[PDB]
Amino acid sequence: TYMEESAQSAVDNFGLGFNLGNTLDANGCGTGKPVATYETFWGQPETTQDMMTFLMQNGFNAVRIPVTWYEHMDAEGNVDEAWMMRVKAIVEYAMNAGLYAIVNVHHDTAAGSGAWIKADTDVYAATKEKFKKLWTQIANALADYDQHLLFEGYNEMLDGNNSWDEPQKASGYEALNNYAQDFVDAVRATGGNNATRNLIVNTYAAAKGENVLNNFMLPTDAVNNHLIVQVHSYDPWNFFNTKTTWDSECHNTLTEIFSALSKKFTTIPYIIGAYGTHGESDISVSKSSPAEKIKLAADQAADMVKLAKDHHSATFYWMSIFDGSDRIQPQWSLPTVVEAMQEAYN
Numbered sequence: 001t002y003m004e005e006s007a008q009s010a011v012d013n014f015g016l017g018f019n020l021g022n023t024l025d026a027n028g029c030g031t032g033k034p035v036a037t038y039e040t041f042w043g044q045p046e047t048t049q050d051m052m053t054f055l056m057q058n059g060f061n062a063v064r065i066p067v068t069w070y071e072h073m074d075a076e077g078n079v080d081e082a083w084m085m086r087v088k089a090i091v092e093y094a095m096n097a098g099l100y101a102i103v104n105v106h107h108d109t110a111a112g113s114g115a116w117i118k119a120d121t122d123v124y125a126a127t128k129e130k131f132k133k134l135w136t137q138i139a140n141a142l143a144d145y146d147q148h149l150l151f152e153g154y155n156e157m158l159d160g161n162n163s164w165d166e167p168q169k170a171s172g173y174e175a176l177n178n179y180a181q182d183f184v185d186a187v188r189a190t191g192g193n194n195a196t197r198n199l200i201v202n203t204y205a206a207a208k209g210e211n212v213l214n215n216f217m218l219p220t221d222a223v224n225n226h227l228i229v230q231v232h233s234y235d236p237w238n239f240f241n242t243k244t245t246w247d248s249e250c251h252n253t254l255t256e257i258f259s260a261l262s263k264k265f266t267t268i269p270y271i272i273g274a275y276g277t278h279g280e281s282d283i284s285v286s287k288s289s290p291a292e293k294i295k296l297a298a299d300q301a302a303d304m305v306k307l308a309k310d311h312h313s314a315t316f317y318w319m320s321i322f323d324g325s326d327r328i329q330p331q332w333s334l335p336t337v338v339e340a341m342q343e344a345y346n
């Protein structure tokens with residue numbers, strides 16, 4: 001049954017979080033394909049109940065489920081039923097396991113081909129009703145799940161030039177804030193559990209700089225304390241390639257970031273919805289990385305988790321700790337990183 005819970009309480013209960021990345025967010029194989037074709041298109045196995053249960057049994061309490069939607073929508077913006085039901089099926093795995101789950105709209109945003117949601121005046125005007133129709137469908141299909149399920153409006157919205165970190169024009173902020181409101185409006189309108197469900201709105205590019213935070217506007221909500229703000233972090237940029245250890249510069253950089261977020265968001269919680277070692281050319285840590293590089297990954301994660309706890313936040317690891325064939329066993333890909341995260345959190 002449904003038990004209404006505040007945004008801050010949800011974030012406090014997330015504990016250690018994980019991103020089921022390159023899975024339902026995988027895209028580019030075209031329209032009209034079997035569900036499993038999309039899900040495995042980027043090298044991940046089909047998700048199982050055992051995976052969600054594994055996370056719960058091993059000290060994690062929340063999973064983010066990225067979803068890319070555009071290849072599953074027809075000309076009128078209707079979502080393929082098999083796709084929607086597969087999203088629902090994976091949510092159900094997570095609910096069964098006792099996890100919090102986040103469902104979003106992922107590579108429909110940002111710099112890849114097929115992205116259609118953009119912080120741009122013309123694009124917003126042309127896609128606003130399509131966007132609201134999408135969220136109405138998602139909210140209705142997932143309506144029956146309780147407070148452990150959250151919706152996240154959009155992943156990493158960029159302007160027309162795909163400008164990371166910050167938009168080139170201030171109108172970009174208008175478009176984002178407008179989308180954000182449309183997202184909240186469309187979900188709340190469906191009523192039921194969606195009337196009070198905790199929802200997540202991301203900053204421009206999910207970035208964290210001074211201008212992006214100052215020009216972020218939280219949507220108006222008829223109910224209290226059911227909104228969360230989300231940002232991402234691979235800071236300091238390219239540290240995995242340029243650093244030999246998680247040094248004082250790395251540590252101070254993270255400390256400053258959390259300080260800036262907590263100073264900005266005084267009354268609403270924020271989360272680090274995706275973080276990791278991914279840097280230039282998306283080079284990232286794996287089990288075949290040198291021990292010093294795996295230690296570098298572990299120290300980042302340890303610091304990220306502890307700072308987040310200190311700042312009444314929560315974190316979701318992007319992919320690397322639980323990846324590919326390791327999901328099938330299931331087993332951690334990076335046990336030492338996870339152990340560092342668990343020790344930091346507990």
Ligand SMILES: OC[C@H]1O[C@H](O)[C@H](O)[C@@H](O)[C@@H]1O[C@@H]1O[C@H](CO[C@H]2OC[C@@H](O)[C@H](O)[C@H]2O)[C@@H](O[C@@H]2O[C@H](CO[C@H]3OC[C@@H](O)[C@H](O)[C@H]3O)[C@@H](O[C@@H]3O[C@H](CO[C@H]4OC[C@@H](O)[C@H](O)[C@H]4O)[C@@H](O)[C@H](O)[C@H]3O)[C@H](O)[C@H]2O)[C@H](O)[C@H]1O
Nearest residue numbers: 027028041042043107110111112155156232274278282318
């Ligand atoms: O960067 C870290 C994270 O940062 C934020 O949190 C983001 O929200 C996360 O999404 C992001 O995660 C990374 O996302 C990458 C996708 O980004 C793209 O879309 C968003 C845009 O903004 C961005 O600019 C785009 O680059 C994701 O990259 C994908 O990785 C897949 C798997 O690759 C892994 O396994 C295979 C191995 O060889 C790789 O070294 C290893 O990294 C790639 O899968 C392959 O895809 C091709 C088909 O590719 C076509 O269609 C997809 C399109 O993206 C390609 O450009 C196009 O050629 C298929 O034939 C192969 O069999 C697959 O292996 C995928 O192509 C690639 O985009 C990244 O891994 C993830 O960390």
